[PDB]
């Protein structure tokens, strides 16, 4: 009765909003971008292939300044790359080994690491004796931790494999937000630009755009068939592209509500772990299990380029903030440098 | 160019460490600990999130992870486990109504595209729970498995001192049901060790130990380009 | 959106026959593995039967073989169970169960409390 009740509505929700969206689908993102000239072939080339990680490397995040760079691995190290020499400026030994994101504070203070230990454990890399040590561990996720971003050097938004993301505090160490509405693992969460709103993809083929203070979804998106590993905000803040194990990455607009692109092709049969847009957005780039990353046209759904650099599942994949390089790190133990 | 020579000297020495610890973790054996919980696999050796339970035996170290913590949906997180040296599946042989779940999680990890060159060293717990289950004859494998009627024990069977028959035929059923799924793909990239115990059990340690050592000999063997 | 819908449940003689069929949408059905999995009054999912991509692939729970029948229309994008022969254990609400990766041979958590591609199940009523 009331079950049933509960669910007729809720499908009667599900059509309106459906139609919704088909009556602001007037046109696609094909036809909008079909008179624009393609971008051409993109050869971007290892230039810097980081080296000293020595199990499979699961996450990677750049830091603000475009330099520096952390990466996690499954040898218990975050290591943190100055990109640009190869030098390594940090050796974190973890915790727990089987480390599944990381994070860069934008002041480059900080780092963050988390996983099947299901903790963010911040550190601070600015200490007064010069050593990296823990300067926080955020317990009170029940399941793993797959994505941490920082907002600033005391919030950080982490995902969970408990279908939950979290806004911490890191100074008071408590969850002051808990986003909750996803019915599988939440494998990513991009921050915004402004950082008032993510977006987060989980194991439910869906996306969710929340708001950071209000601490409610506010919309959702729906269109991938299998779980979102991968997700990242158009750099304007409007729209963003999510990675899943459909061989697909789809871009979402988020004042359109609905799906405004598919990037896929038939030779394509393996899921996307990882996903960032250039600096324009004009190319979305993407980290695939068939051990390679497709450069995409993200106006035209046109596979621009193939950084096929590695030798096993590329799992994580970054764009610098300037837009000067890209680096992916899979599971070969290495990340290389791109442009 | 002094604080770049530093900066040099700072990353050596950060690899001088790296180099250091990821020999010892080379010499250290990982191992995926996995099973439902009647299995009974937290007291297979006998020695919150991810838990850890590290054991020796003939100088090598294992490290064995029993994942708890975590939900019932693992298609994400046990691809952390790509590079395990082997999987310990613990299945609770004697309940039947969840030996096809055992089966099934056995075949999603034996056909996982991260996880189809990893062996597994399947320990079929509860082997005295089988026992006393089979002889008092309440419970019958045919309502859970009618194949097990047409079923015989094999010839290359051994068994225990003093065992019923019986008793033989629903344990090297139960292999055997395991072995159908380990045979059925990925032939040569990963084997699956069977081996039949009890919670008293004490040599499961030296049975893990074995059965990586044939696993770490198949992956030198691959590494050399011998096999 | 990937939607299961499932419909041909109800209260059946022991004995009687039933023919389960969903529909799915949101995905491409030919390129998923598919599943047909139990929750009786009481007790835990249970996994009951798969069918592959093509067809050609199919496994039953024993306590069902030679009594129930899976089959797939891809083209309609249908998954069928047949249920003949029934007995008052196989009442239980039915879920259909969407494996969750594309072209895989392996099937995880379908059996799962909350597996998302799972559609809401139609309940089979297996009494006198």
């Known amino acids: 009765s009331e079950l049933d009740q509960l669910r007729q509505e809720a499908e009667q929700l599900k059509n309106q909003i459906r139609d919704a969206r088909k009556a602001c689908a007037d046109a696609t993102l094909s036809q909008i971008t079909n008179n624009i000239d393609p971008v051409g072939r993109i050869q971007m080339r290892t230039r810097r292939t980081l080296r000293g990680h020595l199990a499979k490397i699961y996450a990677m995040h750049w830091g603000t300044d475009s330099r520096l760079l952390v990466s996690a691995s499954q040898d218990g190290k975050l290591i943190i790359w100055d990109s640009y020499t190869t030098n390594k400026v940090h050796a974190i030994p973890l915790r727990s080994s089987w480390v599944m994101t990381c994070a860069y504070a934008p002041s480059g203070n900080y780092v963050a690491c988390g996983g099947l230990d299901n903790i963010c454990s911040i550190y601070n890399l600015k200490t007064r004796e010069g050593n990296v040590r823990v300067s926080r561990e955020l317990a009170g996720h029940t399941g793993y931790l797959s994505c941490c971003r920082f907002l600033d050097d005391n919030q950080i938004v982490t995902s969970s494999g408990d279908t939950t993301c979290a806004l911490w505090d890191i100074e008071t160490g408590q969850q002051t937000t808990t986003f909750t509405g996803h019915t599988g693992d939440v494998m990513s969460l991009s921050l915004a630009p402004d950082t008032r709103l993510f977006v987060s993809g989980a194991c439910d083929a869906s996306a969710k755009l929340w708001d950071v203070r209000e601490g409610m979804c506010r919309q959702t998106f729906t269109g991938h068939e299998s779980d979102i590993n991968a997700i990242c905000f158009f750099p304007n803040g409007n729209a963003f592209a999510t990675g899943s194990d459909d061989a697909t990455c789809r871009l979402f607009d988020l004042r359109a509500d609905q799906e405004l692109m598919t990037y896929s092709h038939d030779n394509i049969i393996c899921g996307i772990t990882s996903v960032s847009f250039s600096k324009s957005g004009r190319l979305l780039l993407a980290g695939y299990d068939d051990f390679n990353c497709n450069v995409w046209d993200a106006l035209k759904a046109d596979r621009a380029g193939v950084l096929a650099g590695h030798d096993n599942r590329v799992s994580c994949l970054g764009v610098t903030d300037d837009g000067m390089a890209v680096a992916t790190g899979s599971w070969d133990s290495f990340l290389k440098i791109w442009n | 160019s002094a604080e770049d020579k530093a900066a040099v000297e700072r990353s050596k020495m950060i690899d001088r460490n790296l180099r250091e610890d990821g020999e010892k973790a080379a010499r250290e054996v990982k191992l995926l600990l996995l099973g439902a919980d009647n299995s009974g696999k937290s007291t297979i050796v006998k020695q919150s999130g991810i838990f850890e339970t590290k054991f020796q035996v003939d100088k090598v170290n294992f490290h064995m992870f029993d994942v708890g913590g975590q939900r019932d949906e693992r298609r994400k997180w046990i691809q952390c486990f790509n590079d395990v040296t082997a999987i310990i599946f613990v299945v609770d042989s004697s309940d039947y109504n969840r030996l096809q779940e055992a089966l099934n999680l056995f075949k999603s990890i034996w056909n996982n595209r991260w996880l189809r060159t990893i062996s597994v060293i399947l320990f079929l717990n509860k082997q005295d729970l089988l026992a006393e289950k089979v002889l008092a004859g309440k419970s019958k494998i045919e309502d859970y498995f009618p194949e097990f009627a047409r079923y015989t024990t094999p010839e290359d069977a051994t068994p225990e001192p003093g065992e019923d028959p019986r008793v033989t035929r629903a344990k090297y059923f139960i292999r055997d049901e395991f072995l159908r799924i380990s045979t059925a793909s990925g032939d040569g990239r990963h084997y699956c060790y069977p081996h039949f115990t009890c919670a008293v059990d004490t040599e499961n340690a030296r049975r893990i130990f074995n059965d990586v050592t044939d696993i770490i000999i198949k992956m030198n063997l691959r590494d050399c380009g011998l096999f | 959106q990937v939607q299961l819908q499932e419909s041909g449940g109800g209260l059946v003689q022991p004995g009687g026959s039933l023919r389960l069929s969903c529909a799915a949408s949101?995905?491409?059905?030919?390129?998923?593995?598919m599943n047909w999995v139990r929750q009786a009054p009481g007790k835990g999912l249970e996994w009951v039967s798969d069918?592959?991509?093509?067809?050609?692939?199919?496994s039953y729970t024993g306590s069902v073989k030679g009594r129930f029948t899976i089959s797939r229309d891809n083209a309609k994008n249908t998954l069928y169970l047949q249920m003949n022969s029934l007995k008052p254990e196989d009442t239980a609400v039915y879920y259909c169960?969407?494996?969750?990766?594309?072209?895989?041979?392996?099937?995880?958590?379908?059996?799962?409390?909350?597996?998302?591609?799972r559609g809401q199940g139609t309940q089979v009523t297996v009494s006198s």
């Open positions: 169960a969407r494996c969750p990766a594309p072209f895989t041979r392996d099937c995880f958590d379908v059996t799962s409390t909350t597996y998302a591609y």
């Open positions: 949101g995905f491409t059905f030919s390129n998923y593995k």
């Open positions: 069918i592959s991509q093509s067809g050609a692939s199919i």
